[PDB]
Design a protein around this ligand. Structure first.
Ligand SMILES: Cc1ncc(COP(=O)(O)O)c(/C=N\OC[C@@H]2NC(=O)[C@H](CON)NC2=O)c1O
Ligand SMILES: Cc1ncc(COP(=O)(O)O)c(/C=N\OC[C@@H]2NC(=O)[C@H](CON)NC2=O)c1O
Lengths: 424, 424
């Protein structure tokens, strides 16, 4: 039934001017991805004119969905006064005040143009503060393309160093890898490197290794180790921040030294933030002579991203947070029911407005769990739903009971078609 | 004469929620910078309601000046359709076609959210392509905060490794430095590392070491060395692209393997680009199995930045390029006349629409050339002009000969006040 002629035609143009017609690896699909032209509320219209409900929302960025009227007003008005300046603006101060208010530990903030930049500057801040070379990160957790964190970032639980082709030993040797939610196995690695560890970089709810939350026991172990060793505890919440009204660490009963944020904090415009205790952030302070850590960037704190941020945080009320959490719980419950009725051993993980279908046993006619999940992704597209091709989805504030109910129908239908085609 | 009480009040708020009240080192001034609220054409209005002519234009980003009506229309329309998506859009293809058309060597392009990211991904591409660890860069040249290029990036001509506090040996040892416009001195270093060199990273007109162009002799030496060694020649034109209609290397009669771009290519919205021959860019291609170099990012090719880019390149006509070049020549000429009549030995460098006052001999009452230039920056603010605090300025398309004449009057007056206050 699904017509993708206009997507095919865009891809044929794209391959002439981009590598494999791609500018962002995560959005590529074989033989070509669906191209989209517009979004309104919870829905996206593709270039072939097909409207679908968006349950991934630019990889969980769009907490307020597409072209939220209050977001559009704030952003378009900011654009009309100037997109960026070589001078600070009132809105950077207002937005820093708004974000600092969200958690006790967000005492001092700096803005970047991406979570990728923000993770990089948080790592650089820990290295400048401690004057130690090594970082520890979770086996399998993704933190963007910065070479120090683009190590064991592929969802593998293995601790053996595995990096991108060309990432030198000089980088890779200074990133050590700990097992998620294994306190004893983590402390073994951390104690070995204690003298040389600038930071322990975690995601409290990492997507790529199943969207399971960090245990109280594991977070307590890392907090105690960082306190004892002087290593900086960095919580990368670029994705996971949204699980809690005060972020992921606070929800799970822990305190970071530095938190990395992005995505939902501006809900669609380019943003990252480094937010931490004054002493850790003091490496950036240029007011008492040259800073220990210079940090510039043409779009840092640009008033369009700052205005997007102010509007996003204003719309992210405790009531809106609670409501998308309830819709997330309902969505996860309905998916577990549908998977059970279909006879699959697949799990549904997630907190609040986040979920992930984690494919376990490959059904008949699929070479892998991952191939079965890709087939479900394509069947959901055919049945009017966007999710992630490895099972990630999320609730947006424009959604109500009706969108969740429609998702549940499309999910059950799509499972049936995936299984039937595997046996065909 | 100058009232900055509303800037002082914003700074008093800022220091509570940012390190030293700062989110971008380059825009900080002691005791506080001037905060701005709006821009229109060539003019910026500060928070105290004072309108000035902007001659730095967000560090040379705003080639079309502030809130250009055709830019604002294109950006606001894109915002209305959705700020970012987890799917590619028509405008990323249209913008890649427009940017590819600017230079023979821009066969394939990849979009990032900043020049900082684009530099990082160009270096990662060269390392993935060659599977060699080392990069060569210019002594003193700035390329953003990415730790492999945040080495000898402070305007010094010394070849001795000098990096940010905390940047590990593991990074710093794999970045070697060459003397700008010294062919034999550069080849000595390059030939020592030839077997291990992934890339030679240059800026053809580097700001931080005086905004003087690369010589034909030096570019020929590097081009020949890269051809012989297999090292990738990367031209970082994030700042310098605008000197030529086809970019900086083409103006100077040279070809890069990869070009890094940003700033003017979208003229205000967050952007970077990596553009080069298909073979170098093929590491990013995800269409024939897993790519050698994964490269994602939440805002990569976002339709708002792509729409800003389409509008910017449409406005950057050969006629616009010619005219802002005329105004740059007039500005540089007027500054040289004013410096000569004031009895200063300071030089004015630049090509096309870029200029830099390079302070040489400190006049009476100033401890350094840099302190005298900072004083000139403050006096120019008092006299209704924004320039860079180290003497960088540039032309925007809304300017005419009248703005450059007003600048010349303010420049002569400001020199007089700087010298008189030094003798006080
Ligand atoms: C923890 C974390 N840190 C940094 C970033 C990068 O932020 P960005 O430059 O604003 O896109 C991100 C952003 N995106 O990660 C990609 C996202 N996260 C994932 O783990 C999986 C695997 O992706 N490669 N799929 C996804 O779409 C992040 O999640
Ligand atoms: C060659 C080059 N490569 C990369 C970047 C970073 O791009 P961005 O992340 O889009 O701001 C830039 C951007 N800014 O450099 C800062 C600019 N360049 C300079 O050389 C001097 C010295 O730096 N502070 N003053 C400046 O304000 C760049 O010029």
């Amino acid at each position: 039934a699904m017509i993708t002629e206009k997507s095919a035609a865009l891809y044929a143009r794209a391959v002439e001017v981009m590598p494999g017609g791609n500018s962002r690896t995560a959005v590529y699909s074989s033989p070509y991805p669906v191209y989209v032209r517009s979004g309104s509320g919870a829905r996206v219209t593709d270039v072939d004119g097909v409207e679908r409900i968006d349950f991934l929302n630019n990889s969980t960025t769009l907490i307020h969905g597409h072209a939220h009227p209050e977001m559009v007003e704030a952003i378009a008005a900011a654009v009309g006064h100037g997109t960026s300046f070589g001078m600070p603006t009132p809105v950077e101060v207002e937005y820093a005040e708004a974000l600092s208010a969200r958690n006790e530990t967000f005492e001092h903030v700096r803005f970047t143009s991406s979570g990728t930049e923000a993770v990089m500057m948080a790592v650089q801040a820990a290295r400048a503060y401690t004057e130690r070379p090594k970082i520890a990160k979770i086996a399998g957790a993704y933190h963007g393309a910065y070479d120090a964190v683009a190590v064991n970032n592929d969802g593998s639980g293995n601790l053996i160093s595995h990096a991108v082709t060309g990432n030198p030993e000089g980088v890779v040797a200074n990133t050590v890898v700990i097992p998620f939610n294994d306190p004893e196995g983590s402390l073994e690695v951390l104690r070995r490197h204690a003298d040389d560890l600038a930071c322990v970089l975690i995601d409290p709810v990492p997507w790529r290794i199943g969207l399971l939350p960090a245990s109280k026991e594991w977070l307590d172990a890392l907090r105690e180790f960082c306190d004892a060793s002087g290593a900086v505890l960095i919580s990368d919440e670029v994705g996971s921040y949204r699980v809690g009204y005060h972020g992921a660490m606070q929800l799970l009963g822990a305190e970071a030294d530095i938190t990395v944020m992005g995505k939902v904090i501006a809900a669609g415009m380019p943003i990252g933030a480094v937010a931490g205790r004054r002493r850790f952030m003091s490496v950036f302070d240029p007011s008492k002579g040259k800073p220990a850590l210079p940090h510039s960037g043409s779009y840092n704190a640009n008033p369009v991203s700052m205005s997007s941020g102010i509007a996003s945080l204003r719309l992210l009320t405790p009531q809106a947070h609670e409501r998308i959490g309830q819709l997330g719980e309902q969505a996860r419950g309905s998916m577990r029911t549908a998977l059970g009725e279909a006879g699959l051993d697949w799990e549904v993980n997630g907190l609040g407005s986040l979920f992930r279908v984690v494919a376990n046993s490959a059904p008949a006619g699929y070479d892998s769990a991952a191939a079965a999940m890709k087939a479900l992704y394509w069947k959901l597209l055919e049945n009017g739903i966007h999710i992630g091709d490895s099972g990630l989805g999320c609730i947006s504030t424009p959604m109500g009971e009706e969108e969740i109910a429609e998702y549940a129908v499309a999910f059950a239908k799509s499972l049936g078609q995936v299984l039937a085609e595997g046996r065909a």
